[PDB]
PDB file of C-alpha atoms in Angstrom:
ATOM      1  CA  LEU U  11      85.024 -41.501  14.182  1.00 19.73           C
ATOM      2  CA  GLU U  12      84.656 -38.966  11.376  1.00 19.33           C
ATOM      3  CA  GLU U  13      88.016 -39.639   9.730  1.00 18.37           C
ATOM      4  CA  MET U  14      87.165 -43.334   9.938  1.00 16.68           C
ATOM      5  CA  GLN U  15      83.878 -43.051   8.056  1.00 13.91           C
ATOM      6  CA  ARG U  16      85.984 -40.910   5.742  1.00 13.75           C
ATOM      7  CA  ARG U  17      88.473 -43.729   5.114  1.00 13.90           C
ATOM      8  CA  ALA U  18      85.851 -46.455   4.731  1.00 10.87           C
ATOM      9  CA  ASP U  19      84.127 -44.269   2.143  1.00 12.11           C
ATOM     10  CA  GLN U  20      87.420 -43.705   0.348  1.00 12.11           C
ATOM     11  CA  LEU U  21      88.139 -47.439   0.189  1.00 12.25           C
ATOM     12  CA  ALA U  22      84.609 -48.162  -0.931  1.00 12.17           C
ATOM     13  CA  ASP U  23      84.975 -45.638  -3.744  1.00 11.49           C
ATOM     14  CA  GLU U  24      88.321 -47.179  -4.751  1.00  8.46           C
ATOM     15  CA  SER U  25      86.801 -50.670  -4.704  1.00  8.48           C
ATOM     16  CA  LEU U  26      84.044 -49.439  -6.993  1.00 11.96           C
ATOM     17  CA  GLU U  27      86.374 -47.719  -9.462  1.00 11.79           C
ATOM     18  CA  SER U  28      88.495 -50.890  -9.500  1.00 11.84           C
ATOM     19  CA  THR U  29      85.421 -52.965 -10.236  1.00  9.29           C
ATOM     20  CA  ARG U  30      84.401 -50.636 -13.073  1.00  8.41           C
ATOM     21  CA  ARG U  31      87.898 -50.766 -14.558  1.00 10.62           C
ATOM     22  CA  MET U  32      87.729 -54.570 -14.359  1.00 11.24           C
ATOM     23  CA  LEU U  33      84.395 -54.474 -16.181  1.00 14.42           C
ATOM     24  CA  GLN U  34      86.039 -52.478 -18.997  1.00 14.57           C
ATOM     25  CA  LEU U  35      88.955 -54.875 -19.302  1.00 16.38           C
ATOM     26  CA  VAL U  36      86.661 -57.890 -19.287  1.00 17.14           C
ATOM     27  CA  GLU U  37      84.480 -56.360 -21.984  1.00 15.65           C
ATOM     28  CA  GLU U  38      87.399 -55.872 -24.385  1.00 14.10           C
ATOM     29  CA  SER U  39      88.659 -59.342 -23.476  1.00 13.59           C
ATOM     30  CA  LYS U  40      85.288 -60.851 -24.412  1.00 13.36           C
ATOM     31  CA  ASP U  41      85.300 -59.081 -27.775  1.00 16.10           C
ATOM     32  CA  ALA U  42      88.759 -60.503 -28.503  1.00 22.06           C
ATOM     33  CA  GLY U  43      87.656 -63.900 -27.229  1.00 18.71           C
ATOM     34  CA  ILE U  44      84.702 -63.844 -29.603  1.00 18.33           C
ATOM     35  CA  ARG U  45      86.819 -62.765 -32.591  1.00 16.34           C
ATOM     36  CA  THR U  46      89.388 -65.455 -31.759  1.00 16.72           C
ATOM     37  CA  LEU U  47      86.891 -68.275 -31.462  1.00 18.81           C
ATOM     38  CA  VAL U  48      85.265 -67.245 -34.735  1.00 16.05           C
ATOM     39  CA  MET U  49      88.675 -67.225 -36.426  1.00 15.86           C
ATOM     40  CA  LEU U  50      89.526 -70.656 -34.997  1.00 15.47           C
ATOM     41  CA  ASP U  51      86.244 -72.085 -36.299  1.00 14.95           C
ATOM     42  CA  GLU U  52      87.028 -70.640 -39.729  1.00 15.98           C
ATOM     43  CA  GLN U  53      90.579 -71.944 -39.531  1.00 13.92           C
ATOM     44  CA  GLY U  54      89.230 -75.364 -38.635  1.00 18.42           C
ATOM     45  CA  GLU U  55      87.273 -75.512 -41.863  1.00 16.76           C
ATOM     46  CA  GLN U  56      90.246 -74.399 -43.920  1.00 18.50           C
ATOM     47  CA  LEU U  57      92.463 -77.036 -42.379  1.00 20.57           C
ATOM     48  CA  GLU U  58      89.867 -79.677 -43.286  1.00 20.04           C
ATOM     49  CA  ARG U  59      90.028 -78.556 -46.917  1.00 17.16           C
ATOM     50  CA  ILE U  60      93.806 -78.455 -46.751  1.00 16.95           C
ATOM     51  CA  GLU U  61      93.792 -82.066 -45.510  1.00 18.25           C
ATOM     52  CA  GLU U  62      91.370 -83.279 -48.205  1.00 15.96           C
ATOM     53  CA  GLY U  63      93.494 -81.480 -50.758  1.00 16.61           C
ATOM     54  CA  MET U  64      96.716 -83.133 -49.664  1.00 17.48           C
ATOM     55  CA  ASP U  65      94.946 -86.487 -49.942  1.00 16.05           C
ATOM     56  CA  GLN U  66      94.111 -85.749 -53.560  1.00 17.68           C
ATOM     57  CA  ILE U  67      97.648 -84.626 -54.456  1.00 20.37           C
ATOM     58  CA  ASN U  68      99.119 -87.670 -52.719  1.00 18.05           C
ATOM     59  CA  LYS U  69      96.610 -89.953 -54.442  1.00 18.35           C
ATOM     60  CA  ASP U  70      96.740 -88.659 -58.023  1.00 19.37           C
ATOM     61  CA  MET U  71     100.547 -88.634 -57.852  1.00 18.97           C
ATOM     62  CA  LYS U  72     100.524 -92.380 -57.148  1.00 18.14           C
TER      63      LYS U  72
ATOM     64  CA  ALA V   1      74.433 -45.741   2.425  1.00 14.80           C
ATOM     65  CA  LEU V   2      72.153 -48.520   1.186  1.00 17.38           C
ATOM     66  CA  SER V   3      72.054 -47.365  -2.446  1.00 17.99           C
ATOM     67  CA  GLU V   4      75.874 -47.363  -2.604  1.00 16.76           C
ATOM     68  CA  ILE V   5      76.227 -50.767  -0.954  1.00 17.29           C
ATOM     69  CA  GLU V   6      73.701 -52.071  -3.467  1.00 16.53           C
ATOM     70  CA  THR V   7      75.569 -50.621  -6.463  1.00 14.58           C
ATOM     71  CA  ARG V   8      78.980 -51.982  -5.406  1.00 12.99           C
ATOM     72  CA  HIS V   9      77.438 -55.410  -4.822  1.00 13.19           C
ATOM     73  CA  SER V  10      75.631 -55.270  -8.159  1.00 13.57           C
ATOM     74  CA  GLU V  11      78.810 -54.299 -10.045  1.00 11.33           C
ATOM     75  CA  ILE V  12      80.808 -57.146  -8.481  1.00 12.16           C
ATOM     76  CA  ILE V  13      78.144 -59.731  -9.416  1.00 13.16           C
ATOM     77  CA  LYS V  14      77.965 -58.382 -12.957  1.00 15.25           C
ATOM     78  CA  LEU V  15      81.743 -58.799 -13.099  1.00 14.43           C
ATOM     79  CA  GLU V  16      81.696 -62.375 -11.830  1.00 13.78           C
ATOM     80  CA  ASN V  17      79.116 -63.258 -14.515  1.00 12.20           C
ATOM     81  CA  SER V  18      81.219 -61.651 -17.209  1.00 14.13           C
ATOM     82  CA  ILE V  19      84.341 -63.417 -15.876  1.00 16.13           C
ATOM     83  CA  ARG V  20      82.545 -66.765 -16.010  1.00 11.10           C
ATOM     84  CA  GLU V  21      81.853 -66.223 -19.725  1.00 13.00           C
ATOM     85  CA  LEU V  22      85.517 -65.336 -20.305  1.00 12.52           C
ATOM     86  CA  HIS V  23      86.638 -68.472 -18.428  1.00 13.25           C
ATOM     87  CA  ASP V  24      84.424 -70.522 -20.714  1.00 12.27           C
ATOM     88  CA  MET V  25      85.853 -68.805 -23.810  1.00 14.15           C
ATOM     89  CA  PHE V  26      89.385 -69.799 -22.810  1.00 14.27           C
ATOM     90  CA  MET V  27      88.362 -73.364 -21.973  1.00 13.11           C
ATOM     91  CA  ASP V  28      86.672 -73.656 -25.349  1.00 13.07           C
ATOM     92  CA  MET V  29      89.682 -72.058 -26.990  1.00 11.57           C
ATOM     93  CA  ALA V  30      92.118 -74.597 -25.577  1.00 14.67           C
ATOM     94  CA  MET V  31      89.769 -77.390 -26.725  1.00 17.51           C
ATOM     95  CA  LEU V  32      89.586 -76.105 -30.326  1.00 15.89           C
ATOM     96  CA  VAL V  33      93.301 -75.389 -30.492  1.00 15.79           C
ATOM     97  CA  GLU V  34      94.279 -78.868 -29.298  1.00 19.16           C
ATOM     98  CA  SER V  35      91.918 -80.451 -31.815  1.00 19.53           C
ATOM     99  CA  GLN V  36      93.224 -78.371 -34.714  1.00 22.46           C
ATOM    100  CA  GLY V  37      96.716 -79.206 -33.563  1.00 20.67           C
ATOM    101  CA  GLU V  38      96.056 -82.896 -34.298  1.00 18.94           C
ATOM    102  CA  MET V  39      94.799 -81.993 -37.750  1.00 18.56           C
ATOM    103  CA  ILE V  40      97.917 -79.890 -38.238  1.00 19.19           C
ATOM    104  CA  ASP V  41     100.129 -82.839 -37.232  1.00 16.75           C
ATOM    105  CA  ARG V  42      98.550 -84.932 -39.991  1.00 14.49           C
ATOM    106  CA  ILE V  43      98.678 -82.182 -42.623  1.00 16.18           C
ATOM    107  CA  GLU V  44     102.354 -81.652 -41.804  1.00 17.44           C
ATOM    108  CA  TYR V  45     102.832 -85.386 -42.396  1.00 18.65           C
ATOM    109  CA  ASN V  46     100.925 -85.430 -45.677  1.00 18.61           C
ATOM    110  CA  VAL V  47     102.952 -82.441 -46.849  1.00 21.50           C
ATOM    111  CA  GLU V  48     106.345 -84.077 -46.235  1.00 21.63           C
ATOM    112  CA  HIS V  49     105.074 -87.227 -47.962  1.00 22.24           C
ATOM    113  CA  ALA V  50     103.993 -85.174 -50.989  1.00 22.05           C
ATOM    114  CA  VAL V  51     107.260 -83.251 -51.017  1.00 21.60           C
ATOM    115  CA  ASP V  52     109.210 -86.501 -51.405  1.00 18.98           C
ATOM    116  CA  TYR V  53     106.806 -87.737 -54.105  1.00 15.34           C
ATOM    117  CA  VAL V  54     106.945 -84.495 -56.086  1.00 13.42           C
ATOM    118  CA  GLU V  55     110.716 -84.271 -55.602  1.00 12.93           C
ATOM    119  CA  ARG V  56     111.225 -87.718 -57.106  1.00 14.58           C
ATOM    120  CA  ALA V  57     108.701 -86.969 -59.863  1.00 14.46           C
ATOM    121  CA  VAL V  58     110.667 -83.916 -60.922  1.00 16.42           C
ATOM    122  CA  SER V  59     113.952 -85.840 -60.598  1.00 15.04           C
ATOM    123  CA  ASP V  60     112.592 -88.503 -62.942  1.00 16.95           C
ATOM    124  CA  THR V  61     111.632 -85.917 -65.551  1.00 15.72           C
ATOM    125  CA  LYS V  62     114.957 -84.102 -65.130  1.00 17.70           C
ATOM    126  CA  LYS V  63     116.885 -87.335 -65.744  1.00 17.15           C
ATOM    127  CA  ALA V  64     114.749 -88.094 -68.785  1.00 16.83           C
ATOM    128  CA  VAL V  65     115.385 -84.654 -70.271  1.00 16.16           C
ATOM    129  CA  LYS V  66     119.088 -85.184 -69.611  1.00 14.96           C
ATOM    130  CA  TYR V  67     119.142 -88.318 -71.811  1.00 17.81           C
TER     131      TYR V  67
ATOM    132  CA  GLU A  10      63.229 -53.789   9.943  1.00 18.06           C
ATOM    133  CA  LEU A  11      66.352 -51.734  10.654  1.00 15.82           C
ATOM    134  CA  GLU A  12      67.877 -54.905  12.083  1.00 16.97           C
ATOM    135  CA  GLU A  13      66.921 -56.704   8.881  1.00 15.33           C
ATOM    136  CA  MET A  14      68.358 -53.990   6.640  1.00 14.68           C
ATOM    137  CA  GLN A  15      71.672 -54.454   8.452  1.00 13.35           C
ATOM    138  CA  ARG A  16      71.219 -58.169   7.852  1.00 12.49           C
ATOM    139  CA  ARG A  17      70.925 -57.379   4.135  1.00 12.88           C
ATOM    140  CA  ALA A  18      73.999 -55.132   4.242  1.00 12.55           C
ATOM    141  CA  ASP A  19      76.074 -57.835   5.929  1.00 10.90           C
ATOM    142  CA  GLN A  20      74.523 -60.236   3.413  1.00 14.34           C
ATOM    143  CA  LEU A  21      75.565 -58.275   0.326  1.00 16.28           C
ATOM    144  CA  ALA A  22      78.963 -57.346   1.769  1.00 17.30           C
ATOM    145  CA  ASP A  23      79.697 -60.999   2.482  1.00 16.20           C
ATOM    146  CA  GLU A  24      78.394 -62.066  -0.934  1.00 14.81           C
ATOM    147  CA  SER A  25      80.682 -59.523  -2.599  1.00 14.49           C
ATOM    148  CA  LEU A  26      83.747 -60.916  -0.830  1.00 13.27           C
ATOM    149  CA  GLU A  27      82.871 -64.481  -1.817  1.00 13.11           C
ATOM    150  CA  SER A  28      82.121 -63.481  -5.408  1.00 12.46           C
ATOM    151  CA  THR A  29      85.524 -61.785  -5.446  1.00 12.39           C
ATOM    152  CA  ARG A  30      87.171 -64.900  -4.025  1.00 10.44           C
ATOM    153  CA  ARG A  31      85.458 -67.048  -6.663  1.00  9.98           C
ATOM    154  CA  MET A  32      86.574 -64.671  -9.416  1.00  8.68           C
ATOM    155  CA  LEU A  33      90.165 -64.982  -8.245  1.00 10.90           C
ATOM    156  CA  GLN A  34      89.765 -68.733  -8.807  1.00 11.77           C
ATOM    157  CA  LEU A  35      88.070 -68.598 -12.233  1.00 11.95           C
ATOM    158  CA  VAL A  36      90.686 -66.132 -13.434  1.00 14.54           C
ATOM    159  CA  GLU A  37      93.509 -68.368 -12.290  1.00 14.89           C
ATOM    160  CA  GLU A  38      91.939 -71.311 -14.121  1.00 14.17           C
ATOM    161  CA  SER A  39      91.466 -69.166 -17.241  1.00 13.61           C
ATOM    162  CA  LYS A  40      95.093 -68.060 -17.171  1.00 14.69           C
ATOM    163  CA  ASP A  41      96.447 -71.618 -16.965  1.00 15.65           C
ATOM    164  CA  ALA A  42      94.175 -72.578 -19.847  1.00 15.75           C
ATOM    165  CA  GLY A  43      95.404 -69.538 -21.755  1.00 17.00           C
ATOM    166  CA  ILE A  44      99.020 -70.509 -21.166  1.00 17.58           C
ATOM    167  CA  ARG A  45      98.463 -74.109 -22.316  1.00 15.28           C
ATOM    168  CA  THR A  46      96.784 -72.655 -25.382  1.00 15.95           C
ATOM    169  CA  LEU A  47      99.689 -70.281 -26.022  1.00 18.69           C
ATOM    170  CA  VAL A  48     102.134 -73.192 -25.784  1.00 18.24           C
ATOM    171  CA  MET A  49     100.111 -75.157 -28.335  1.00 18.93           C
ATOM    172  CA  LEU A  50      99.715 -72.148 -30.671  1.00 18.39           C
ATOM    173  CA  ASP A  51     103.482 -71.612 -30.649  1.00 20.82           C
ATOM    174  CA  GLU A  52     104.236 -75.170 -31.744  1.00 22.76           C
ATOM    175  CA  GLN A  53     101.498 -75.042 -34.368  1.00 24.61           C
ATOM    176  CA  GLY A  54     102.873 -71.806 -35.798  1.00 25.92           C
ATOM    177  CA  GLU A  55     106.179 -73.539 -36.549  1.00 27.89           C
ATOM    178  CA  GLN A  56     104.413 -76.571 -37.964  1.00 29.15           C
ATOM    179  CA  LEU A  57     102.460 -74.218 -40.189  1.00 26.74           C
ATOM    180  CA  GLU A  58     105.716 -72.610 -41.383  1.00 25.03           C
ATOM    181  CA  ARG A  59     107.105 -75.976 -42.532  1.00 23.19           C
ATOM    182  CA  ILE A  60     103.778 -76.819 -44.107  1.00 23.83           C
ATOM    183  CA  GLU A  61     103.908 -73.566 -46.064  1.00 24.19           C
ATOM    184  CA  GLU A  62     107.531 -74.199 -46.978  1.00 22.24           C
ATOM    185  CA  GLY A  63     106.679 -77.688 -48.197  1.00 22.35           C
ATOM    186  CA  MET A  64     103.848 -76.387 -50.341  1.00 22.74           C
ATOM    187  CA  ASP A  65     106.179 -73.873 -51.951  1.00 22.42           C
ATOM    188  CA  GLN A  66     108.502 -76.713 -52.958  1.00 22.62           C
ATOM    189  CA  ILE A  67     105.571 -78.798 -54.195  1.00 22.85           C
ATOM    190  CA  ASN A  68     104.308 -76.076 -56.530  1.00 22.85           C
ATOM    191  CA  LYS A  69     107.883 -75.385 -57.588  1.00 22.64           C
ATOM    192  CA  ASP A  70     108.774 -78.973 -58.468  1.00 21.25           C
ATOM    193  CA  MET A  71     105.374 -79.558 -60.039  1.00 16.16           C
ATOM    194  CA  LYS A  72     105.877 -76.620 -62.399  1.00 15.68           C
ATOM    195  CA  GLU A  73     109.360 -77.870 -63.259  1.00 15.23           C
ATOM    196  CA  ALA A  74     108.135 -81.430 -63.808  1.00 19.19           C
ATOM    197  CA  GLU A  75     105.285 -80.196 -66.019  1.00 17.79           C
ATOM    198  CA  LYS A  76     107.845 -78.091 -67.885  1.00 19.50           C
ATOM    199  CA  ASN A  77     110.195 -81.030 -68.354  1.00 17.95           C
ATOM    200  CA  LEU A  78     107.336 -83.210 -69.603  1.00 17.44           C
TER     201      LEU A  78
ATOM    202  CA  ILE K   5      85.876 -53.047   3.719  1.00 23.31           C
ATOM    203  CA  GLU K   6      89.674 -53.064   4.024  1.00 26.76           C
ATOM    204  CA  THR K   7      89.851 -56.760   3.117  1.00 27.88           C
ATOM    205  CA  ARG K   8      87.238 -56.594   0.356  1.00 29.88           C
ATOM    206  CA  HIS K   9      89.189 -53.702  -1.200  1.00 31.59           C
ATOM    207  CA  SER K  10      92.367 -55.720  -0.777  1.00 29.46           C
ATOM    208  CA  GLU K  11      90.786 -58.705  -2.520  1.00 30.69           C
ATOM    209  CA  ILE K  12      89.440 -56.454  -5.257  1.00 28.84           C
ATOM    210  CA  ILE K  13      92.796 -54.786  -5.913  1.00 27.45           C
ATOM    211  CA  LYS K  14      94.376 -58.216  -6.259  1.00 26.97           C
ATOM    212  CA  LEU K  15      91.656 -59.397  -8.620  1.00 30.53           C
ATOM    213  CA  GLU K  16      92.269 -56.298 -10.735  1.00 30.57           C
ATOM    214  CA  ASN K  17      95.878 -57.454 -11.053  1.00 29.84           C
ATOM    215  CA  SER K  18      94.907 -60.859 -12.343  1.00 31.63           C
ATOM    216  CA  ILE K  19      92.167 -59.506 -14.630  1.00 31.06           C
ATOM    217  CA  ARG K  20      94.696 -57.105 -16.156  1.00 30.41           C
ATOM    218  CA  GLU K  21      96.911 -60.130 -16.867  1.00 27.80           C
ATOM    219  CA  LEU K  22      94.050 -62.171 -18.290  1.00 26.27           C
ATOM    220  CA  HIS K  23      92.924 -59.279 -20.524  1.00 26.29           C
ATOM    221  CA  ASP K  24      96.415 -58.736 -21.904  1.00 26.95           C
ATOM    222  CA  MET K  25      96.626 -62.483 -22.512  1.00 25.61           C
ATOM    223  CA  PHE K  26      93.302 -62.447 -24.389  1.00 28.61           C
ATOM    224  CA  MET K  27      94.483 -59.588 -26.604  1.00 27.23           C
ATOM    225  CA  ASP K  28      97.803 -61.259 -27.462  1.00 26.64           C
ATOM    226  CA  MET K  29      95.982 -64.539 -28.140  1.00 23.66           C
ATOM    227  CA  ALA K  30      93.686 -62.914 -30.716  1.00 20.93           C
ATOM    228  CA  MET K  31      96.700 -61.482 -32.587  1.00 18.31           C
ATOM    229  CA  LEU K  32      98.496 -64.824 -32.627  1.00 16.78           C
ATOM    230  CA  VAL K  33      95.473 -66.627 -33.993  1.00 18.20           C
ATOM    231  CA  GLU K  34      95.085 -63.954 -36.664  1.00 16.83           C
ATOM    232  CA  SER K  35      98.690 -64.160 -37.834  1.00 18.80           C
ATOM    233  CA  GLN K  36      98.389 -67.940 -38.088  1.00 20.03           C
ATOM    234  CA  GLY K  37      95.194 -67.332 -40.020  1.00 22.03           C
ATOM    235  CA  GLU K  38      97.261 -65.522 -42.648  1.00 22.46           C
ATOM    236  CA  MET K  39      99.515 -68.540 -43.086  1.00 23.25           C
ATOM    237  CA  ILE K  40      96.620 -70.961 -43.309  1.00 25.25           C
ATOM    238  CA  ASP K  41      95.012 -68.702 -45.908  1.00 27.12           C
ATOM    239  CA  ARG K  42      98.193 -68.985 -47.976  1.00 27.24           C
ATOM    240  CA  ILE K  43      98.474 -72.722 -47.300  1.00 26.86           C
ATOM    241  CA  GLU K  44      94.910 -73.334 -48.433  1.00 23.18           C
ATOM    242  CA  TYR K  45      95.698 -71.399 -51.609  1.00 23.48           C
ATOM    243  CA  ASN K  46      99.021 -73.073 -52.383  1.00 20.77           C
ATOM    244  CA  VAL K  47      97.209 -76.383 -51.889  1.00 24.12           C
ATOM    245  CA  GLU K  48      94.427 -75.518 -54.313  1.00 22.05           C
ATOM    246  CA  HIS K  49      97.088 -74.714 -56.910  1.00 21.69           C
ATOM    247  CA  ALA K  50      98.780 -78.034 -56.212  1.00 20.67           C
ATOM    248  CA  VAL K  51      95.535 -79.917 -56.744  1.00 22.44           C
ATOM    249  CA  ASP K  52      94.921 -78.341 -60.147  1.00 20.70           C
ATOM    250  CA  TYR K  53      98.595 -79.085 -60.779  1.00 20.48           C
ATOM    251  CA  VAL K  54      98.239 -82.828 -60.130  1.00 18.90           C
ATOM    252  CA  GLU K  55      95.275 -82.853 -62.507  1.00 20.38           C
TER     253      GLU K  55
END
């Protein structure tokens, strides 16, 4: 029953290291998510200006 | 024994909370992207329309110059 | 007390498994959302290329027209 | 313990995939941002052209 407690402890340690690695991956993913959402919001504003602009070109041409 | 069980539990919960925020980021991302996609559809349309206008405008002036 | 501490242990251990099982679900949902998003971003990228190409022509013809005038 | 570990190892596999997907997404959005930047510019110079 010694080698068993030994295994359980080994698995528990692996499960913990896995969880910590997952925490690291999730952290970098959140940073990218944040950067991406901020870019999309910016891009949304630029596309609104692009659309207003095209309306002006199309209008003044007529 | 107890301290370790507590730490592993705590780490897993902290991960689930972090993963819930990431899930939300992707959901919000798909929403924004689909919305901007509709604005892109329209812009694409306005651009082709302008291209034809401008192309005729230049053709007119080119013909004029010719004669 | 000791009996209760074991109750806690079995409590946390079970909660961990369920949290893990929930995470597997949230992650799967996130992935599908991410794929739909990728699909959309791919189409938009091409639309944006034509848009850019159209604008090049517009500024080209406009300069020519202005020149001709 | 053996099942929890098994469920955790599998979750790690999906989180790795999700992470990688988040990183590639950010790069895509940024590249498209470059185009839009140019588009917005070319459009400003088309507006002052029509005037």
